[PDB]
From Swiss-Prot, chain B:
Domain characteristics, as noted in the entry: MVP 3 mediates interaction with PTEN.
Source organism of the structure: Rattus norvegicus
Function: Required for normal vault structure. Vaults are multi-subunit structures that may act as scaffolds for proteins involved in signal transduction. Vaults may also play a role in nucleo-cytoplasmic transport. Down-regulates IFNG-mediated STAT1 signaling and subsequent activation of JAK. Down-regulates SRC activity and signaling through MAP kinases.
Protein name stated in the entry: Major vault protein
Post-translational modification: Phosphorylated on Tyr residues after EGF stimulation. Dephosphorylated by PTPN11.
Subunit structure: The vault ribonucleoprotein particle is a huge (400 A x 670 A) cage structure of 12.9 MDa. It consists of a dimer of half-vaults, with each half-vault comprising 39 identical major vault protein (MVP) chains, PARP4 and one or more vault RNAs (vRNAs). Interacts with TEP1. Interacts with PTEN and activated MAPK1. The phosphorylated protein interacts with the SH2 domains of PTPN11 and SRC. Interacts with APEX1. May interact with ZNF540.
Location(s) in or outside the cell: Cytoplasm; Nucleus
Transmembrane regions: none
């Protein structure tokens, strides 16, 4: 290319190789159309991928930001995208989206993940999850398909795979209570304060229950005759 | 070859010998067609083998990455290929494939193995494997051909050969319990907490 008398050469541009594992983050420096003829006003940010071109060229009206990696959610992985791209083409700022199930995408412009690629909750017959409805009376959208108030809590157990819905928060992992013949623990139903003693077979704590402490007034060294006895047992 | 006035010689190229035990990993530097006339866009990566040519030549539009060894799975060997090449011709990123049974292939571009050439589980009448369904209610695809929930666990025993399916994880190797006349151990059924004492024969 011979530079004309009126033209001035600055430098060569290198079209960054767009692979399946990478995407190009660009931003408009003025109102124009890119190589594919797409309307890009000043300030707007967009992504470029293999679907568009195998190598897009940093244009004079395009500012390169970086290289977006294909956020790959494995078969038992999930993530919570903050400020997710709505259908209108703007970030839903102050909201969040949940995605999972062998999916793979590029993180849309002006977004991020809460934790970033979390392991989908998988829990057996002896493993439970205590959840809390932080938002409002969702009768659909949860495994049970039942309404949860906005503040209360509940427990989900059974051999299944759970994931934090876009309304709820996980409180704790209900576990660790195996009982046999002539053995048990004390539990207090917090809602009513009904202290009781369950014995016999293995028992997981119902949503409103919690381990209760039974004090023995100077009768410990008698019936215990090194380790401090479990006063909830 | 006499270099013309307008042409400039840089250096000689050596076509790397493609054997049955080796494959050539190449990548496109621009949109073009290779010697065999195959469409290769920029950034794309492909493999070359004895099936194509006995010695393919690093071309100017081809970038040499390395030499892929034929990953040879023996008669009692297996492997778990991460990001396996789907039928569309792209890596299924975030997934994995299981292969075994005297097989031998070249690792497709942008892939790897979990452990890399594992010994297929072989276990006698006194050897068991505790497994855990990490994923969802697979009624087919396992030896038993029965559904497993997603989180529970089960045991497989008997004189057979097992392999980790593309859904399950091995927990432990059930073994080490031989009993005879007037001998036994205490066992607790964790699901119900039913502590009991089995005696007599091996269990």
């Amino acid at each position: 290319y011979l530079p004309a008398v009126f033209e001035e050469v600055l430098d060569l541009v290198d079209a960054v190789i767009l692979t399946e594992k990478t995407a190009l983050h660009l931003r408009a420096l003025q109102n124009f159309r890119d190589l594919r003829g797409v309307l890009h006003r000043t300030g707007e940010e967009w992504l470029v991928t293999v679907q568009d071109t195998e190598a897009h060229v940093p244009d004079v009206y395009e500012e390169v930001l970086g290289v977006v990696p294909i956020t790959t959610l494995g078969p038992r992985h999930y993530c919570v995208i903050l400020d997710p791209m709505g259908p209108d083409g703007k970030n839903q700022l102050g909201q969040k989206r949940v995605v999972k199930g062998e999916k793979s995408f590029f993180l849309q412009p002006g977004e991020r993940l809460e934790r970033g690629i979390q392991d989908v909750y998988v829990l057996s017959e002896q493993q439970g999850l205590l959840l809390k409805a932080l938002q409002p009376l969702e009768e659909g959208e949860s495994e049970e398909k039942v309404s949860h108030q906005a503040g209360d809590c509940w427990l989900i157990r059974g051999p299944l795979e759970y994931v934090p819905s876009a309304k709820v928060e996980v409180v704790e992992e209900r576990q660790a209570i195996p009982l046999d013949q002539n053995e048990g623990i004390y539990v207090q139903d917090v809602k009513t304060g009904k202290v009781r003693a369950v014995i016999g077979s293995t028992y997981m704590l119902t949503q409103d229950e919690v381990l209760w402490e039974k004090e023995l007034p100077s009768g410990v060294e008698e019936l215990l005759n090194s380790a401090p006895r479990n006063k909830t047992r």
